[PDB]
Design a protein around this ligand. Structure first.
Ligand SMILES: CCCCCC(=O)N[C@H]1CCOC1=O
Ligand SMILES: CCCCCC(=O)N[C@H]1CCOC1=O
Ligand SMILES: [Co+2]
Ligand SMILES: [Co+2]
Ligand SMILES: [Co+2]
Ligand SMILES: [Co+2]
Lengths: 275, 275
């Protein structure tokens, strides 16, 4: 019978406008309107399934921040990640007695700095990623982009560690990985190619892992509120509606990428698991 | 020999983030990064052509602002328009000795509040608009909304005045209206359906009227910088690169929708014209 764990991988801050576009626009009464630097959780999900362990997302690399950090100086200043050692993914998995080598599948929802940071650890797993997300990230690496949401040094490590990539093709969807585990292909929106997961647990029922396809309950609405920069704005809205449709049709609970209030209410890996 | 006039229809202010997405993101060093309330021009272009007068865009309706105005209270607070009487389109046309009835074609770049506000004046002209922009605007009208970029009162007047609509089909492009005057179909991006104009003047050469397909030189780049909330982000970028291509292939100047610096340099209708 499967078990699902939520692993707390620390906290990030950023301009609220990144999360909710134009959340507090300047007005005639408030012409120099101040923004807020909001804090939110970075997390990963491990499903201990009889057919093999599945990891959804990988958080940020431990070598991300600081003077030796792989993240560019501007990136560090705009999206600072705060994490104690116990929050690092390798330690969260050790606390669960799971070796990186024990992971059969890693699902990269996309290849942003806060989701693909530790792909390099999983050299025996099949790494599942949207083909267009893979292409886009690799182009950034080829252009030697040292700032932004695709981290040059993380990509460099994925290449050096010769990972076992499986790309989800842009027309593929509802990819069954194991009994009750299905990859949802949301396509372009937040990024070039977004993957989610539907998990059917015997007791808890249906769960949809949305990652950055839906940042928060405020994003989800209604009304739907898009993020402040967005690769494909039409695809973003289409993807949120797809998530709502699947949630309704399957009676599933939607887990957002970065909702503080929702995350606070989750049972974490240190206290237990879902079933 | 044609003559082209730039008519000054006042000024609007708004949060700079509407114009340039995330122009000044909050950082560790400034967590409450202030925005700014920028000012920019609203303008229209009249081409006095031997085959007939052609108007590109129509500015804002004179009854837009004020507690008893057509624009919603929230919209007025975020996008205030200031205009002396001489700036109203009917007055700018009167100053040029052009009656509304003398206009043969009006090109509605799109149907937003600051470009379609005076369509109702032109009851003898053919009103040229993208089919999907027309559909979208009419749907908002049918929903009886009081806030947003599509103004119920304006649309209500277009219908009651029985305008002579010609829709440009989504796959139609490079539509010749007169010698040296060609409609460019940019499609969806900033809005559902954006139209621009290419004008070939004997002395001045090529001019592309971009309207809201490109707000400003800063938008145009490179790098291209999209607006804070964008309907179709991929379409927006495709449309900017189409404008760049056409400008290069035809050696044309590009006239942005709302660039303060560029507009200051234009010869206005009270001082003269282009040929
Ligand atoms: C430089 C633009 C980066 C914007 C997108 C981004 O990387 N946003 C983080 C915040 C949490 O989820 C993310 O991926
Ligand atoms: C509330 C969405 C705003 C849509 C964008 C818009 O209407 N922007 C104005 C500002 C000047 O050019 C425009 O059309
Ligand atoms: Co992301
Ligand atoms: Co994220
Ligand atoms: Co507009
Ligand atoms: Co405009």
């Amino acid at each position: 019978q499967p078990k699902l764990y939520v692993m707390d991988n620390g906290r990030m801050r950023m301009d609220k406008n990144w999360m909710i576009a134009m959340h507090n626009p300047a007005t005639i009464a408030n012409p120099n309107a101040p923004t807020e630097f909001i804090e939110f959780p970075i997390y990963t999900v491990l499903i201990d399934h009889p057919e093999g362990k599945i990891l959804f997302d990988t958080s940020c690399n431990p070598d991300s921040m600081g003077a030796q950090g792989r993240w560019g100086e501007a990136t560090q200043s705009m999206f600072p990640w705060t994490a104690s050692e116990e929050c690092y993914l390798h330690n969260r998995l050790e606390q669960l007695k799971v070796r990186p080598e024990d992971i059969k599948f890693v699902i990269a929802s996309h290849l942003h700095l806060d989701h693909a940071g530790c792909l390099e650890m999983f050299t025996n797993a099949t790494i599942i990623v949207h083909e267009d997300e893979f292409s886009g990230a690799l182009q950034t690496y080829a252009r030697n982009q040292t700032e932004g949401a695709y981290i040059w040094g993380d990509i460099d490590a994925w290449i050096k560690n010769n990972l076992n990539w499986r790309t989800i093709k842009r027309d593929e969807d509802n990819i069954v990985l194991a009994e009750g585990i299905k990859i949802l292909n949301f396509g372009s929106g937040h990024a070039w190619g977004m993957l989610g997961l539907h998990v059917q647990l015997p007791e808890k029922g249906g769960i949809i892992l949305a990652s950055d396809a839906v940042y928060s309950a405020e994003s989800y609405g209604p009304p739907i509120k898009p993020p402040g920069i967005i690769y494909d704005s039409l695809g973003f809205v289409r993807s949120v509606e797809k998530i709502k449709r699947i949630a309704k049709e399957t009676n599933s609970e939607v887990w957002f990428g970065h909702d503080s209030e929702q995350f606070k209410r989750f049972r974490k890996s240190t206290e237990g698991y879902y079933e």
